[PDB]
UniProtKB/Swiss-Prot annotation, chain A:
This is 26S proteasome regulatory subunit RPN6. Component of the lid subcomplex of the 26S proteasome, a multiprotein complex involved in the ATP-dependent degradation of ubiquitinated proteins. In the complex, RPN6 is required for proteasome assembly. Changing L160P: In rpn6-2; temperature-sensitive mutant that shows defects in proteasome assembly when incubated at 37 degrees Celsius. Component of the lid subcomplex of the 19S proteasome regulatory particle complex (also named PA700 complex). The 26S proteasome consists of a 20S proteasome core and two 19S regulatory subunits. Residues 18-163 form the PCI domain. N-acetylated by NAT1. It comes from the Eukaryota. Belongs to the proteasome subunit S9 family. Signal peptide: none annotated. The chain holds residues 218 to 380 of 434 of the full protein. Present with 16800 molecules/cell in log phase SD medium.
UniProtKB/Swiss-Prot annotation, chain B:
PROSITE patterns: PCI (PS50250). Belongs to the proteasome subunit p55 family. InterPro entries: PCI_dom (IPR000717), PSMD12-CSN4-like_N (IPR054559), PSMD12/CSN4 (IPR040134), RPN5_C (IPR040896), WH-like_DNA-bd_sf (IPR036388), WH_DNA-bd_sf (IPR036390). Present with 5710 molecules/cell in log phase SD medium. It comes from Saccharomyces cerevisiae (strain ATCC 204508 / S288c). N-acetylated by NAT1. This is 26S proteasome regulatory subunit RPN5. Gene3D superfamilies: Winged helix-like DNA-binding domain superfamily/Winged helix DNA-binding domain.
Length: 163, 432
């Protein structure tokens, strides 16, 4: 019941409320152990980290994966896939984001529910990628920005006037 | 009384195997129990109850001896505190026998329920028993089994007992945690024993572990802010137990750590240091480089960086050395930061053609380190690509420009007031 509660909050965002149901659910699936399938507990761990990424919090994401008592018997490439995404989201670059995007697409993106979130992060991190390019303030070349991000000129200029 | 006649009680059982020794211990168990119970602290002789250990030692396996301690643990044992003096007897024949009993010694520790289960903690014995089992695991090549045993022992801390020896027990897991491959486990242990021993004076053997474990954890972290902190604390304060010949070169690595760290508040403290200027020339050579932070032109630095590396690629008393690339990996990144801080505090604007010649880098490598310092909130510089210049002047509002002008007006009144009082002070020489 608490699992499907936070899922309905994905459309209207406001992930601070959905995180309350995701945190309380992890204690329920962890106490079941052999009484249920281990795959169900792995999906709950994904909903907690992906909800904190939308809230733009780096420390709260690293407090779980780096903690050995949070994962324990639950580990896989799909769980560690969010670690590379969190590092790419913190650095705000499409180089490390797209590197693990197509590699884990058969694992991390295998869930159609969470797939809609990565599509929003495409335009979200791209606007965040421009923040790392504008670090030397103003007086930068538009053509020089397109060569760094590696996209079309019309595609970059469309996202520059958006922000 | 009856305790002095124990030698003459059984004549024949001394020269034989004496299979009835198990029955003789049970007969004395019920008799001496009613005469002591929990009333008298020390009444019955501990040697009488521990005599069964000396009866069968090298003439029988230790499996039957552990069964006798199990029955005494479940029963009263003639006293409630008698178990305290029984395990003290167990620690004698262990180191005096060895031979083929080293392999069976592991089963002896695991069989005893006092060292395993938690008790009233009158022992101050089992702490060394647990360490003996871990030393066997380290000799067998198991890094994980050695660190996991002492991890649960440090959870229960005795009230007082050993003071300086207990510190070594707490610091023992920190040494085996890094060997396990995780340095984050020893971080929690450094936040407990260090605070309690901060105000207490440490002896010679106490500070030997802090000289290593404190800088060893941050060694793999590659963070030099914590390396030059805990090291200088033990170095500057006391540290008179060591030899002054090897004590001076320790400072040579301390100054080298300030360059790899993002500056610090300890740089000016070592400039006025007495022992830093004199004695070893490497101490003054690295100290002379500290005054060059503001005057850095980057011109002569790679000449020395490629020629003289006394503390750079050669480490002895601190890091012990790793590789030539590892020590120079973060070295080149800091030297660039030393130059950019000077230009930001000197040049208001400079062309990219000249800035690349001063940094000895390309166009891509130049804007890489400059843009990284902007996000860290250190240097704010506006790079002008069309003009091919970088403006280091930060913008100021109208209130900030008028505020600094107000400090000058108040400063001019100080010079007017100072000179006003100097006329009367210098009137002695003028009116002479």
């Amino acid at each position: 019941l608490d699992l499907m509660s936070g899922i309905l909050h994905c459309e209207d965002k406001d992930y601070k409320t959905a995180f309350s149901y995701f945190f309380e659910s992890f204690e329920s699936y962890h106490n079941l152990t052999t009484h249920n399938s281990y795959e169900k507990a792995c999906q709950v761990l994904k909903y907690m980290l992906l909800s904190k990424i939308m809230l733009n919090l780096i420390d709260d994401v690293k407090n779980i994966l780096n903690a050995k008592y949070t994962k324990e018997t639950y580990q896989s490439r799909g769980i560690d896939a969010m670690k590379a995404v969190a590092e790419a989201y913190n650095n705000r670059s499409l180089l490390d984001f797209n590197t693990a995007l197509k590699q884990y697409e058969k694992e991390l993106m295998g869930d159609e529910l969470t797939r809609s979130h990565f599509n929003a992060l495409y335009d979200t991190l791209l606007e965040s990628n421009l923040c790392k390019i504008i670090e030397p303030f103003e007086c930068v070349e538009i053509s020089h920005i397109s060569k760094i991000i590696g996209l079309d000129t019309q595609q970059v200029e469309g996202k520059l006037s958006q922000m | 009384k009856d305790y002095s006649q124990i030698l003459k009680e059984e004549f024949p059982k001394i020269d034989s195997l004496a299979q009835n020794d198990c029955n003789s211990a049970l007969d004395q168990l019920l008799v001496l129990e009613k005469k002591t119970r929990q009333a008298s602290d020390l009444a019955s002789s501990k040697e009488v109850l521990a005599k069964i250990v000396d009866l069968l030692a090298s003439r029988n396996k230790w499996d039957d001896l552990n069964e006798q301690l199990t029955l005494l643990s479940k029963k009263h044992g003639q006293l409630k505190l008698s178990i305290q003096y029984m395990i003290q007897k167990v620690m004698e024949y262990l180191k005096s026998s060895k031979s083929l009993d080293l392999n069976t010694r592991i089963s002896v520790i695991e069989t005893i329920r006092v060292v395993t289960e938690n008790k009233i903690f009158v022992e101050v014995e089992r702490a060394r028993v647990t360490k003996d089992l871990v030393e066997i695991k380290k000799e067998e090549g198991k890094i994980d089994e050695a660190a996991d045993i002492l991890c649960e022992l440090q959870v229960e801390t005795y009230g007082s007992m050993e003071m300086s020896e207990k510190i070594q027990f707490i610091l023992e897991q920190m040494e085996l945690s890094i060997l396990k491959g995780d340095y984050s486990q020893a971080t929690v242990l450094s936040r407990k024993i260090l605070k309690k021993t901060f105000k207490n004076p440490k002896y010679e053997s106490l500070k030997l572990e802090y000289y290593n474990l404190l800088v060893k954890i941050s060694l793999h972290k590659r963070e030099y802010l914590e390396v030059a902190q805990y090291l200088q604390e033990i170095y500057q304060t006391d540290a008179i137990k060591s030899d002054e010949a090897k004590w001076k070169p320790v400072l040579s690595h301390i100054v080298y750590f300030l360059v790899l760290s993002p500056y610090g508040n300890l740089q000016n403290d070592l400039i006025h240091k007495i022992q830093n200027d004199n004695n070893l020339k490497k101490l003054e050579s690295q100290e002379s480089l500290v005054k060059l932070f503001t005057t850095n032109e980057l011109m002569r630095w790679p000449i020395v960086q490629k020629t003289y590396e006394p503390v750079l690629n050669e480490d002895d008393l601190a890091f012990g050395g790793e590789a030539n690339k590892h020590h120079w990996e973060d070295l080149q990144k800091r030297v660039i930061e030393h130059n950019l801080r000077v230009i930001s505090e000197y040049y208001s604007r400079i062309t990219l053609l000249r800035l690349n010649e001063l940094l000895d880098l390309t166009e891509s490598q130049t804007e890489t380190y400059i843009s990284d310092l902007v996000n860290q909130g250190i240097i704010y510089a506006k790079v002008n690509r069309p003009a091919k210049i970088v403006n280091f002047e930060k913008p100021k509002n109208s209130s900030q420009l008028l505020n600094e002008w107000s400090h000058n007006v108040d400063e001019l009144l100080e010079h007017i007031e100072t000179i006003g009082h100097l006329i009367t002070k210098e009137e002695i020489m003028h009116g002479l």
